Amino acid sequence: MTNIRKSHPLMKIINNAFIDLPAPSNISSWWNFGSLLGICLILQILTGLFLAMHYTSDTTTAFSSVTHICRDVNYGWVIRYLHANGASMFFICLFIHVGRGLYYGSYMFLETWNIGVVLLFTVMATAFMGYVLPWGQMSFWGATVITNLLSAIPYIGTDLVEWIWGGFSVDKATLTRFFAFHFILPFIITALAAVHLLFLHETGSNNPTGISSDMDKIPFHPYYTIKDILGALFMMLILLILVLFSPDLLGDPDNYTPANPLNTPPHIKPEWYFLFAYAILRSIPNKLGGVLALVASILILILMPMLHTSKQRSMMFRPLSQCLFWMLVADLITLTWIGGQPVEHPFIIIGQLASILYFLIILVLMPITSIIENNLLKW
C-alpha cells in the first residue's frame, strides 16, 4: 500500500508543487505576492469570462453592451468593476513582485527571471487590449496613439500598423480582433506561469538573507498555505474597498463617453500602470528613440542578472545599494506622476531627468555601488 498523495500522478505533481515543497522558513510577506498574482489571474480568468458572455465586440454595441452589463444585468456592475480594479491590483502585485525579485537577488534564478520578463510583456499587452475593449473615448484614442507609435520602425514599421489595425485606422476589425486576442492571451499567461513555477522548483525559493537555506527548509502545506490564504484575503480586502466604495477611482472619467473619431479628449493618458513608460516615451523627442526606450524600459530587467557584481546576492546587507534601490522606486513613481501631467514646463525637463536617472541607476549606479561595496568588505 502506498500513500495516494505521493503516488498518484496528478497528486504527486500537486504534492511536489504546493504541499510538501521544501520552502525557507524566513520567507517574508513580500513573497506572498507570488501566489496573489495567480489568484488575481484566476479571478481575472473568471470575471472576464462572465464579462465575455455579455459583451458584443462591435463598435456600435460595445459601449451599449458595457452599459447593459453595468445596469441591466443581475449583479453585473460588481463583475465589471471587479475586472477593472482587479487589473489595477494585478499590476500592483506584479510591480511589487518585480521589486522583490530585484531586491533579494532572485534574478540569480535565470530561467525563472526570463520567464517572468516574458510574463510581464504578455500581461501588459493583454491589459492594453482589454482597456481597448470597452470602446470609450480614452480607449479609442489611446489605442490610436499607441498603435501609431509602431510607425517609427524603419521600412516595415508602416506596414505593421494597418496589419494590427485591420484597416486604415482603429475601427471595427481592431476592436473585434482585440477582443479575440484579449480572450486568448491570459491562457498563454497561465501556461507561462506554470512553466515559471516549474523552473522555480528546481532551485527553490530565495530567502531574504540570500544565502542557501537548504538546512532550514519547512513543508509548504501547514505553514505557507495558511500564510498565502491570509495574503489573498488581505488583498481581497483592498480590492473590495476599490470596487465597492470608489470603483472609478483608478481610471479616467472620459472613458465613460462613447468613442468618437472626431474629438480628441482634452486629457490623454494610458492607464495608471502604463504612465511610467509613457513618461520615457514623451521624454525622447525622436519617435524611434521613444519606441526603443519603451521596449528597453522593460527589457532592461534581462540585463539585471549580468550586471550583478556584489558578492552578496541579497540586498539585506547592502545599505548604499538599498538607498539606490529606493531612489529607483521613487524614480518610477516620479515617472508615473510625470506621465499623468501634460507635457509642459517644468514637467518636460523633470521627465527627461527622471528617465536618464532611471536608466543610469539600473545600468551604472548599481554595479559601481556593488563594486565599491565589495572593495569595502575585503572581497
Add this chain to the structure above:
Amino acid sequence: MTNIRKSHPLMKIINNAFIDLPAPSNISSWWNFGSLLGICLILQILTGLFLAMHYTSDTTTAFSSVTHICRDVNYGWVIRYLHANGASMFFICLFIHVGRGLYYGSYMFLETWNIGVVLLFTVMATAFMGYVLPWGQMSFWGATVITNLLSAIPYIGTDLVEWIWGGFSVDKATLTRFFAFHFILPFIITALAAVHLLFLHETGSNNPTGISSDMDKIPFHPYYTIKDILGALFMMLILLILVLFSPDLLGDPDNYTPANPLNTPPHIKPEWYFLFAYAILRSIPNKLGGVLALVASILILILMPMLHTSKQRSMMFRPLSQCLFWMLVADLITLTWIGGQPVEHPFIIIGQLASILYFLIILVLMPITSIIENNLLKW
C-alpha cells in the same frame, strides 16, 4: 556535461513524451488517430481564433459577421470552411479513436479511459455551442430543441433551462454566453488532453496483439513521429478535399437562412455527429427516459472496463466477439441514419430496435460472448 535533451527541466518532459518515449514496435495505423485528434484540435484552435477575429456575437449581426467572413475578408472562406470541416473530421477521428480503444482492449488503462470519456463530453458540448454560433435557422432551432430537452429533469427542469438560455428563449443572452463558453472550453480540452497523455505514459501503450510490449519498445523519434506526420498528411488530404471540393457536403443548407424565431424548418436534424444520440433520444417515448438514455449512451463507455471478462486483453484473437463489435459499428451507423430521418412509421420501430440492440451488445451480448470463448479455449 549532459545532453540538453535530458538536462533542461522543460526539455525533460518533451523528450520523455515524444523523443525517447518507449512505444510498442507493432503499433498499427489505428493508433495514429491519437495524434490526428490533437493536431486537429490545434487547427480548431488556430482557425477558431481567426473566426473570433471577425465576429460579433450579436443576434442582429452574427450571421452578417459570418457572411462578411466568408465573402469579404481575405481568404475568410478558407478559414471558415476549414474550421467547420475540421470539427466534423475531428469527430470522425474521435469515433475511430473510441473504436480502437474498444477493440484492442485499451479500456484496461482506466484513468486514461475515464479522462477520454470526459474529453468526449467536453468536445460534444463545444461542437454544440459552435453550431449555435452562426445563428442560422437550423442553429437556432436545434439549440432550442436540445436545450428544451433539459426540461425533462424533474423539479429543477424549467429553472435550469431558463438558466442555460440566459432568459426566456434562445436570444441575445444565449448566443453571447455560448460564444464565450465555446472560447474557454477548448483550452479545458487541451489541459485535459495533457492529463490524458500523462496518465497514458505511465502504462506505455496497448499494441494490437494486446500482450505487453515492454520488451519490444522502440524510440519514438525516428519512428512514429514520421508515421504520425504521414497520418497528419492523410488527414490534411481528407480535410482539404472536403473544404476545397464540397465545403457544405456535411452540413444542412437550411442553416444559410437567417435564424427566424417564427418559422420552424421542415427538419430539425442536428449535425451529423450527434444524431447517433439524438436518434436514441427520439426512441424513448418518455422525455426524462429519453434524456437519461441519451446521456447513458455516452456514459456506457465508463462501464466498459468493468464488463470485460475475456481473459485476453485484445480483440485480435476473439472472432465471435469481433462479429459482435462490427455489429455494434453497424448499429451506430444505423442510429445516425435514423436520426437523420424523420419520425415516421418505418423509422420509429427501426430506431427502437437500433437503440435496444446497441445497448444490448455493450451490456449483455459482449460479456456473455466473452464467457463463451473462455469456456471454448479451456479456461
Add this chain to the structure above:
Amino acid sequence: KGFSYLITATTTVGVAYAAKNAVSQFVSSMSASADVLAMSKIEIKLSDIPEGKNMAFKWRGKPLFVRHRTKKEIDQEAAVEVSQLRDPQHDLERVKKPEWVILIGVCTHL
C-alpha cells in the same frame, strides 16, 4: 482544543457566508437580465375590446391575436369534431375563456 477549533469554526463559517454570496452573484449573473424580464416577461393584455375583435399585439417576439370569440363562434368551435381535426386538441381543452381566446399570431407551416 475547543478554543482553537472555535477560532477555526468562526473563520470557516464566515468564509462559507462570503463564498455563497460570491458564487450566487455569478449564478444570478447567469440568470435572466433585467431587460429580458421586462419585455419578454409577462406583458399584461387588455379586455376592454369588443366582441369578435382580434386585438393586434406584438409580444414575446411574435404577434398576439387575442380575439373575443362570440357565442356563435364558441358553439361552432365546440361542435367541431376533434377527431377530423389535424390537431388532437378540443376547443374547450385549448381555451380557458371560451369568449376570450388568445393565440400567437404566427401560423405554423411558415
Add this chain to the structure above:
Amino acid sequence: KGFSYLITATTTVGVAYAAKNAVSQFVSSMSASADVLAMSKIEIKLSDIPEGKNMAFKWRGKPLFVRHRTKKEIDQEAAVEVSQLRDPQHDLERVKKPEWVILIGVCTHLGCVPIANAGDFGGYYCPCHGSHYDASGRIRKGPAPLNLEVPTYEFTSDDLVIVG
C-alpha cells in the same frame, strides 16, 4: 545517400511551399478587409461647403478637413509669411485650388483641438502647444515638426473634388 536525401529534400521543399502559402493565407486574412479598401478609395466630396468655412469628414478613417477658403482668403494666405517658419509651402503649392484646401486631420505633436475655421493666426490655433496651423495647414506660430500632410487627389472638377 544522395537518393535518400533527395527524397527528403523534395519533401522539404513541398512542405515549405505549403507552409508559406498557408501562413500567408492567415496573415492576409488578418490584414485589411476588402470592404475597408473599398471605403479607402476615392471619396465623394461635393459642393456643400460654402466659402471661408472649414468642415470635416472621416475619409480613410481619419478626420479630414476640407476648408473652402474664399478667393479673398486666397489673397489673405498670399500675405501669409513663409520663409521664417518651418514649412513655408505656399498654399498655392499644396492645393491646386486654394479655394478648396484639404488636409488629413491629426495634429502631429500631440495637440488639443486647434480651433477650426479661420483661426486667429490664419486658419487655426492649436491650444496644447504652439504651431497653430495656418489656413493651408502649415505651422504658423511654432516650429512643430510638420504640418498636417495633404492627401493626394485626382479632383474631377470644381465643386466636384474627389480626394482618395
Add this chain to the structure above:
Amino acid sequence: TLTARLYSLLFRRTSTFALTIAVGALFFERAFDQGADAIYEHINQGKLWKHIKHKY
C-alpha cells in the same frame, strides 16, 4: 553518378541542405504556380474573366 556528385556537393552539409531547400522552393513556387494556373485556365477556357476581358 549524378546523384553521387549531387550529394558530395550540396547535401553533406545540413546548412547547405537548407540553402538548397530554400533556393529550390524559390523556383518551385514559381514553376508550380505557373503550371497549375496553366492547367486551370486550359480546363476552363473561355469562361474565366481573364479570357473574356478583351470584349469590354
Add this chain to the structure above:
Amino acid sequence: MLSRFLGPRYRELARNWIPTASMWGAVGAVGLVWATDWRLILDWVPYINGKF
C-alpha cells in the same frame, strides 16, 4: 563573456565555424526574402521576377 572567451583556440574555432554560420545567415536571408515575397530583391532576380 570576458577574457575567458578571448584566446587563440577561440579565434581558431571562430574561423572554423565562420563559413557555416555565414551561409546559415545566407539561408536565413533567402528564407526571409522568400517568405516575405520581398520585391526589392525579387525584381532583380531571373525567372522568379516574372511572378509580378
Add this chain to the structure above:
Amino acid sequence: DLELHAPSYPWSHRGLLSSLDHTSIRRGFQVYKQVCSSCHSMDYVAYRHLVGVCYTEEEAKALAEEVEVQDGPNEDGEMFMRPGKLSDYFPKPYPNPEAARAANNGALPPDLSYIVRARHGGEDYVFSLLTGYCEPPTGVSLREGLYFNPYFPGQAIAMAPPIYNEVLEFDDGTPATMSQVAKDVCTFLRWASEPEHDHRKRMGLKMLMMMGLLLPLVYAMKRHKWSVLKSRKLAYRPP
C-alpha cells in the same frame, strides 16, 4: 405530400475543376437587376464584388450610379438622396419586411445572397422551379393568388411567373428564351452564394497536385526510416 426533387442538370460549373461561365454571370446579373430585383433583394452583395467577375470598373461605376441609394444625415438634419457608387450594396426593393409582405399577396421574397446555398438541391432546384410552372392537376384548386409549382414545397408558391419567353433583351444579343434566362440567372445566383467558386476550385487543383507529390515521398520517407524495423530478422539462441 411528396417532394419532387430537382433532377441533376449538367451545369458547366458542375465539374470537379470547372468554374462558372463568367459571361453567363454577366447575362445572369441583368435578369436579376431587371426582373428579380423588382421584388427580391441581394442585400449581402455590393457592386464592388461585381467588378472583375462579370464587369469592369467603369461599367460597375455606371451601373452603380444608375440606381439611387440612401446616405446618412446631411448637414441639415435629414436624409439626402445620392446616386450609388462602388461601395453600395444591392438596393433593397422594399423599406422593411412588413412592407415586403404587404406589397405581395402576403409572402416574403427571400434574399438571393444564399438561396442556392439554402435550398436543398441548389441550382437544379431554382432553375427547375422557374421552369416548373404548369396548370394545376385536376382535383387541386389553389386559392386566388396562389400559383402551382411542383418543385416548391407544398406546390402553392405565391410567385407570379417571373420568366416568360422574351422577357428582356440581352446586351450581347443571345436569345431571350426562358430556358436561357433561367440558366444564366441560376449561374449568377450560384456565384452570389459562392463567390470563391473559381478560386476554391483553383486552390483544390493545386492541392490535388502537390499532395499527389508529397504523399508518396513522405511515404517513401517513412518506409525509408522504418525499414530497419521491417528487416529485423530476429534469432533465438538459448543454451
